[PDB]
Fold this sequence. Notes:
Blueprint: E1 11-13, E2 18-21, E3 26-27, E4 31-32, E5 38-43, E6 55-59, E7 62-67, E8 78-83, E9 93-96
Amino acid sequence: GSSGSSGQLEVLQDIADLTVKAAEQAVFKCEVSDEKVTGKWYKNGVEVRPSKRITISHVGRFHKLVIDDVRPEDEGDYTFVPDGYALSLSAKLNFLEIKVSGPSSG
C-alpha cells in the first residue's frame, strides 16, 4: 500500500445560481475529480428526489438535475454532497414570478 490511501476528492466544476420563472426547466451540472463517486441534491436542507417531472441523470464524473414546472418553492439553495467525501457545491435558484398589473375585463 503505497501512496494509495492519501487522497481526497476535488471540485473541477461547481454549480452557479440558476434564474428561472414559473413553468420552466432548471438544470444543474458539475464536475468532480471522480467517476465512481455518488451524491444527492439538497434544497434548502431537503433531500431532492426525482419524479414524473424532475429527472436526474448520472454521467461519469458529471451530475445532472432537471426540474420541470418550476415552482416558487424550488427557489432556495441547491447543495450537492458526494457520499463518502466532505465536499459540497453552492448554487442559488432564483424564481421569477410574472407580476400581474392592469387587469382586463370581459
